[PDB]
């Protein structure tokens, strides 16, 4: 992963942006990521949310 | 060595310029030394990168 610049991830002031981005990111689905490329050719029929 | 001033390389706010230089900065080839100097005044056949 490399979601920090160096050092800022263990910065003190930074914990609260780092929290957050830890928070956001998840570990890498490869197959959730080739279906969002998918869907975004694929017909819709049923409603995304 | 002597690539920083004293205290600045165990200095907090100062460990991004410190990678940076210690990323830069290698052991001291005396053959490669030597070896840039002579450059300098050796005549170019094969293009220098």
Do not use: C, G, T, W
């Given at each position: 992963?490399?979601?920090f610049?160096?050092?800022?991830?263990?910065?003190?002031?930074?914990?609260?942006?780092?929290?957050?981005?830890?928070?956001?990111?998840?570990?890498?689905?490869?197959?959730?990521?080739?279906?969002?490329?998918?869907?975004?050719?694929?017909?819709?029929?049923?409603?995304?949310?």
């Amino acid at each position: 992963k490399r979601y920090f610049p160096e050092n800022l991830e263990q910065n003190q002031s930074a914990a609260r942006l780092v929290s957050a981005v830890k928070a956001r990111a998840s570990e890498a689905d490869i197959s959730s990521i080739h279906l969002a490329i998918a869907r975004e050719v694929s017909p819709m029929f049923n409603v995304h949310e």
